[PDB]
């Protein structure tokens, strides 16, 4: 009824990482460690790093799914709003209803769960390129947090799960997301509100 959000490193030491993009007015994606919250513009690249302490088996995959953060909304499927699901902006692979897309990965698969109706996007787990210490997935969020008839100002969390080839859990991490026009300003405001509290 509600997917778990419990952080779980598992046998491979799985966890996420984020770049340090700052809070300038022009920034398009920025992550707040103090809030565990990503702030991003609509349909812009969100680099999310994957870190492990040891190599998971061939066939391991990485799934992303959004849920509402507030308990009274957690059973509602997070989906694109009535405008954005109809705006014909598909990449040829993501269903138009899905909030979260993966950029530039032809092996991405989009699931409409037959029992929960929830949406997710899953890719093969890949090792870092030679010379790199981690792997990065580029996500896009395809509605604003404020979109009426969709998220409608309700905060969401993205849950990233490392899965075996059957879909069994190997690791889990998560972060809050706000999709907004000015992520740098909103991160600064929310961090200041946190400090004042």
Ligand X SMILES: CCn1c2ccc(C[NH2+]C)cc2c2ccc(-c3ccc(C)s3)cc21
What residue ranges bind ligand X (CB under 6 A)?
Answer: 50-52, 55-56, 58, 60, 124-128, 133-135
Is-contact 123 61, C-beta < 8 A? Answer: yes
- Rank residues 71 and 130 by Cβ distance to ligand X and give the closer one: 130
CA distance 163 to 62: 6
Within 13 Å, how many C-alpha atoms sit on residue 100's CB side? 31
- Rank residues 33 and 59 by Cβ distance to ligand X and give the closer one: 59
Report, in Å, the least distance between residue 191 CB and ligand X: 28
CA distance 108 to 101: 9
In terms of Cβ atoms closer than 10 Å to its own Cβ (0-12, 13-18, 19+), residue 190 is middle
Report, in Å, the least distance between residue 153 CB and Zn ion: 12
In terms of Cβ atoms closer than 10 Å to its own Cβ (0-12, 13-18, 19+), residue 25 is exposed
Site string for Zn ion, 64-103 (x = CB under 5 A): -----------------x--x-------------------
Q: Which residues are annotated as a binding site for Zn(2+)?
A: 81, 84, 143, 147
The residue from 48, 143, 162, 179 that contacts Zn ion (CB under 5 A) is 143
Within 13 Å, how many C-alpha atoms sit on residue 168's CB side? 6
- Rank residues 34 and 134 by Cβ distance to ligand X and give the closer one: 134
- Provide the binding-site residues for Zn ion, judged by CB under 5 A: 81, 84, 143, 147, 150
């Amino acid at each position: 009824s509600v997917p778990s959000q419990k952080t779980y490193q598992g046998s491979y030491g799985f966890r996420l990482g984020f770049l340090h993009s700052g809070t300038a007015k022009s920034v398009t994606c920025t992550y707040s460690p103090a809030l565990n919250k990503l702030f991003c513009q609509l349909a812009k690249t969100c680099p999310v790093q994957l870190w492990v302490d040891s190599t998971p088996p061939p066939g391991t995959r990485v799934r992303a799914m959004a849920i509402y953060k507030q308990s009274q909304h957690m059973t509602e499927v997070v989906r694109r709003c009535p405008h954005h699901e109809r705006c014909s902006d598909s990449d040829g692979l993501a269903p138009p209803q899905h909030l979260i897309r993966v950029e530039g990965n032809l092996r991405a698969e989009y699931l409409d769960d037959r029992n929960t109706f929830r949406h997710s996007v899953v890719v093969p787990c890949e090792p870092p390129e030679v010379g790199s210490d981690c792997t990065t997935i580029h996500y896009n969020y395809m509605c604003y947090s404020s979109c009426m008839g969709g998220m409608n100002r309700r905060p969401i969390l993205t849950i990233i799960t490392l899965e075996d080839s059957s879909g069994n859990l190997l690791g889990r991490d998560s972060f809050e997301v706000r999709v907004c026009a000015c992520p740098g300003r909103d991160r600064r405001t929310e961090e200041e509100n946190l400090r004042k509290k």
